[PDB]
Design a protein around this nucleic acid. Sequence first.
RNA 1: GGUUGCGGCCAUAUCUACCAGAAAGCACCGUUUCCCGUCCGAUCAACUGUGUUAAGCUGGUAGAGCCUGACCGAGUAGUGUAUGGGUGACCAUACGCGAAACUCAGGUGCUGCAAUCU
RNA 2: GAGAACAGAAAUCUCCAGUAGAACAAAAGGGUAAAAGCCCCCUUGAUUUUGAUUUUCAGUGUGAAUACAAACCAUGAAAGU
RNA 3: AAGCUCCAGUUUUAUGAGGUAAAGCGAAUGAUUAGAGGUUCCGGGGUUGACCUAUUCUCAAACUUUAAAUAUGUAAGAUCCUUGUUACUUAAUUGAACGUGGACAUUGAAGAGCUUUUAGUGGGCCAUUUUUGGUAAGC
RNA 4: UCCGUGAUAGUUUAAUGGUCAGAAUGGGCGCUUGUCGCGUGCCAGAUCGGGGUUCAAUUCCCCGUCGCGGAGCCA
Lengths: 160, 181, 297, 168
Amino acid sequence: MGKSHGYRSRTRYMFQRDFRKHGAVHLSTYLKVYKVGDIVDIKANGSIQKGMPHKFYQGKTGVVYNVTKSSVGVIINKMVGNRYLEKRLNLRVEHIKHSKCRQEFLERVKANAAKRAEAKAQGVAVQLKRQPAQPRESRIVSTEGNVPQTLAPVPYETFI
Amino acid sequence: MARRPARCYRYQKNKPYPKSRYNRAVPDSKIRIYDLGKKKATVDEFPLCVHLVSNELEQLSSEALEAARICANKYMTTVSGRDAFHLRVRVHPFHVLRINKMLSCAGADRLQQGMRGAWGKPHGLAARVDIGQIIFSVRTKDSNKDVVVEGLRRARYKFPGQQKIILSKKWGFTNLDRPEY
Amino acid sequence: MAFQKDAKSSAYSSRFQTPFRRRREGKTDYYQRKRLVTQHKAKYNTPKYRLVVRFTNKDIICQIISSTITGDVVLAAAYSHELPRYGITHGLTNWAAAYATGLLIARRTLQRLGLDETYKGVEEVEGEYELTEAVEDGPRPFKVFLDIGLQRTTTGARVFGALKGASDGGLYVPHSENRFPGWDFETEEIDPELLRSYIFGGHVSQYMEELADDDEERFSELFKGYLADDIDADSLEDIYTSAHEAIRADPAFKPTEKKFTKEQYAAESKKYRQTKLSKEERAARVAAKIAALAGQQ
Amino acid sequence: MSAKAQNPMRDLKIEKLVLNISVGESGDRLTRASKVLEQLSGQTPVQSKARYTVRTFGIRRNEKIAVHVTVRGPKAEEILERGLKVKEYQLRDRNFSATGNFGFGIDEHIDLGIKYDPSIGIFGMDFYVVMNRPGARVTRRKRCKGTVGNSHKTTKEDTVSWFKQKYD
RNA sequence: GGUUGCGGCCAUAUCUACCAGAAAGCACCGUUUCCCGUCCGAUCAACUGUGUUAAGCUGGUAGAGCCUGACCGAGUAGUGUAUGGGUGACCAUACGCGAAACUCAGGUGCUGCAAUCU
RNA sequence: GAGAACAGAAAUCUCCAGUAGAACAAAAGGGUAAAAGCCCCCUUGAUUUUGAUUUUCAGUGUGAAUACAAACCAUGAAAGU
RNA sequence: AAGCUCCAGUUUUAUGAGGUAAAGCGAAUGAUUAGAGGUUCCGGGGUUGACCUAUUCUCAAACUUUAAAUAUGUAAGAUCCUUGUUACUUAAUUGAACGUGGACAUUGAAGAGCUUUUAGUGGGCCAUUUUUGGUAAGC
RNA sequence: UCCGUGAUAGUUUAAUGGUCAGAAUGGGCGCUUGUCGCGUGCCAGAUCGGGGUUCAAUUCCCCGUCGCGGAGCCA
C-alpha cells in the first residue's frame, strides 16, 4: 500500500514540551540513579536527543526491574492480542521521572501502620482484618511467581 | 457563473482547507472591499448601529457575498448619496472549495483511470458563517435607519442561509460607552 | 531608546528560563557540570578566576562539593585567607599559595573524619617533590573530580596547582603529568614529557632577580621557609567568634531593606506613588508616566 | 546628593584602533598592501576572510580579500598621534557615530613613512577608533557577560571632548 | 541586614530611571617582565595592590511580560450519556463535566548547604 | 540600527541591541545557547567480539536502534565521551 | 474438545495525552485605520513646507504549533525490622544495595492460570457516534 | 481532457559543472564602388510569465501561458 508505519510519526504533541519546560534540561535529572522496585513514569523529554524509547510507550508507568550501565531497564505492559508478553524497555533516566503517588502512598500506609501497632497492643479498631493477617502468610514475598499470575489476564479473552 | 446551485456548498463540509502550502492557484476573492462609505471616519459619530445575523450554519459563496453587499451598497449610495455613512463586512471569504471540473467524453471518462481521487482542482473561495454569526456591521444615523434596513432586505435574496436584521448592544449601548475623559 | 525586548516578549521572556541564577551570574556551564556529576564522584571546584568573581588577583578558594537531593553540599572548604594562620605572609594570588591551599582542602577532606578515617596508605603524602604522581593507589583515583568552572586548561594555570596540592594532600585525583603546573612550577623540582621548564614557583624569584621596585620581604629563599611550614601535619580549623550582636543589622542595609517592598507587599510606597501620580495627572493631563496617555475626542 | 564630582573612571580610554583595508586581490595584488599597513601600524596584519555571498567576483568564500590590524594600548596611541595629524581639523561631528566612535579614511602614504619601501598602496582603509569606558570588559570578557547600559556607553559629546583635548 | 561558594524550583527571577555587600569579611586597577592569548594583554595566562564604590555580583526602589487566584463572562463555548423536535441541514432535553476575554489581587523571585560576617 | 571616501552585490571591520526567529549536508517536524551550534588543536573507536531488548511484528527474518562486557586505543585535566 | 493446577474486576488517588477556541511564535489571505519616526526620487515656493514608500503604539474575521486547554474516552500504575555471612562500583577509598541464612511482627467473587490437538476463513453487511474522499448515491 | 515534450537578442536555434550565455541571420556602422547592393572591417540581450531553495540560480524545484506529439476500446 501507501505510506509508512513508523516510530517518529504522530509525535508532535507528545515530543514537544511547554513554553515553560523549553530550554536545556538540568543535569540533576541525568545524574539521578534509582533502585529496583521504584516506580517511574516514562515520558520522554523533548530536550534530550538520545536514549529515547519507542514513542508509542510514553505515558506508561513501569517498575525499574534492573539497570545495566547508564540507561535503566523498565518493565511495562502494552495491550491487545493473545498471550501478550510484558516488555523490558531500555530507557534513560532523563526520560524517567519519579512517581510521587506511590511515595506518599507508602508514607501514608506506613504512618498509619505505626498508629495500628499501638492499637494492636491496647485497642480494638477493627476487628475482622486482624483475623487473616497473623495466620496469613509468608510468601517471602517478593518473588517472580506472582508476576505471571498478573501477566496472564493482560491478554484478555473477552476484548479480543 | 457555472451552475451548481448552492446545494453543493451550503452544508458544513471538510477538515479545513484553506491551508497555504496545500493549494497553489485558488480562484480569487471577488469581494470589492470590506469596509464601505466613510472609511475615513471613526465609529463614534454614528448613534445607530445595525447588524445582520445568521439563523443557520453554512458556507456562503464569494459571489453571493459580493452580490449581497453590492446590492445593499447601491441602495445606500443612491438614497444617502456618495459620501454616506459607514459599513463593515463581518466575514471575509477564506475557505477553499474543491470540485472536479468537467470530465470529457473521450471514452476517456475521467482519464485519470477510473478515479476521483483527492487533490480536486480549486473552484474558488467561500466563507464559513455559523449560527448567530454577523455578516454585516453597519454604523449610521437614525434618519437613514430605513435605508440601511431595505439595503439589508435586498441583501438577503443573494445568499441562501436564513438571516435576521438586528439593533446592536455590545459593550454599553452607545452612551455608557462615552462618560470617561 | 530600546527595550526592544518588551514588544517581542514571551520568547524574550524564555531567555532566563533556560538558566538559573548561576548562568545569569555567569559562572557555571551546565554541560561542563554534567560530565562530572553523573559519575558520583565529588566535584572538586577550584574556581581561580571569575567566581562571582569572588577572589582573584587578591585570593583563591577551593571547596570539594558533592550532590544531594536538597542541592549541593560542601563537605569541606579551604580559603587562602586562612592559609597565613599556619604561617605564610606572602601573596595569596601565586602558585605556591594555590598549591598550599590545595593541600589544605585535601587535609580538611580527609581530616581523618567520619569515624571513618584515612590515615593509611599513605597519609601524609609529604609536601613534596613528587616527581610523578605516586599513589598506592596507582591507577585508581576517586572521591574528588576536578571542576575547573570557566577556568582554562592551560598547562601552567593556577586551578590545576590546587589539584596537585590535593594529590600531595591525601585526596588522590585523576591527573596527567604533561598537564600540571609541574613540580618545579610550585618549587619543588621537575620535569618529564614533551613539554619542558623548570621554574615557576620561583618565577617570582626570577622576576625579583630582575631589578625593580616590588613588594618587600626579600627574595627566592622565603618561598622555601613558609612552604616548609606548609609541609607540616598541623590540621584542624576553625575559628570562632564575637557572635553576632543584635539584630538584623547593618547601617546600609536598613534604608536598603524594609517596609515597602518587603518579601511581602509594598503597599505603602506603591499606594503613595499611585496617589501622587493621580494628583499630578489631575493638574496637568497629557502623558501618563510612560509616554502614552490620550484618546480621540 | 546624587553624585557630582571629579573621578577618572568616568573617563575615556582608547579601546582600539583597527586599521582595515578593504581591497580585493588581483586589482592591486595578493595581500601586498599589508606591507603598507605593516609600516603604518608597526605590527603584522592578518588576512580578512570572506564568508559573504556577493554577488560580482568573490564567490570563494575562503580567501584573503582584505587585511587588518588591531592595535591596542600604546601601539594604538602612537598611530593615533600621526593619524590625527594628517587630516587637519576641527573635523566634523558627523564622522563620529552614536557610539562615541569615529573613523576617517586616507592613503597609507600619509604618515611619516618611506614611500619607496611599500611595494603597493591604496586609499584605502578606514582608521577606526574605538573609545569606551573602563567598565566595558563586563560585556567584552567571556563569563559574566552583562550588557553596557546607556550611562556606561560613551556619547558623541564625550568622545569629541576627550579627543579634541589632545593633539587636535 | 544577610554578600558569597555549590545547587534545586527554573516565566512569581525579560526588559528600562536610581539608592547599597566595602578602613583591614568585592569589583576594579596595576606587573600585563613572564608559564599564557594572540591579530593587539583586548582574549586569556600568570604576579600584585595607589586606593575607589562608577559600573559587577547581589541587595533597596518603579511599568509592558508572565504564573496564581477573586470578579463578571457567571457554567457561557464545547463535551461522553440517554432522547424529543426540524423539510433538510439542524436543534433541544435530562445525566455527568466545563475553556475564551473583564477587572481586581498577590509576586520585578523562591528554596536548601556552606566561605559564614561588620 | 549606527559608524566608516570608494560600492552598486559589497563583502570588511566596528559598536550597540540581540534568547533558540540562526546554526545544525539532505524531507518533515522537533530540538538545543560557555549547546549537539561556531573555532582551534589533536586524533581515527567509520576496530574486533558478543550483543540484553525494541522496531521489524504483540509470536515472524534481514535490517535498524538502545545498553553492555571482553579486546584496543584516542582525545581529554580527567572524570568521561 | 480433552485434561492439567489451584486468581478477575472498580470508584478513588496520581501521571501524561486527543481537542479546538482565543492569545503567543512561525505563515498569514486580508481590510479598514488614526496617531507617527524614519526611505528614496524629483519638483515648486517663502530651516520650513505640497509629492510616493514605510517602522512604530493601533483595529473586523479563517488556517496549521503552543499555553491553559475545556472535554472526554481513556490509558498503562495501587510489606517491614533486626541479627550474621557474602558480594559490589567507586583513592588501600566511600558508601549503598545485592543475594543468602536465621529470628521477629503485619464495591466486588469463578468473571480464573497452563497444555496437546482440532475447524471454518485468509469476500462481509447495516445502523449509531466521530469522521475522510465524493455534488450526491441503496457511494 | 490525461500522460509525454518544449520555449535564449529583430528572428532560428547552440550551451553549463550552481559562481562563466552564444552562434547564424537580421539590423545599425563605415569602406567599397558612377550610384545602390554583394563583399570587407566595426557593433548591441531583464535566457517565456511566475514564485521558492542557496553562498552564489541562465543552470535546481513548483505553477501557468502557448505551441506540440501520443491516446482514445465493450456502447
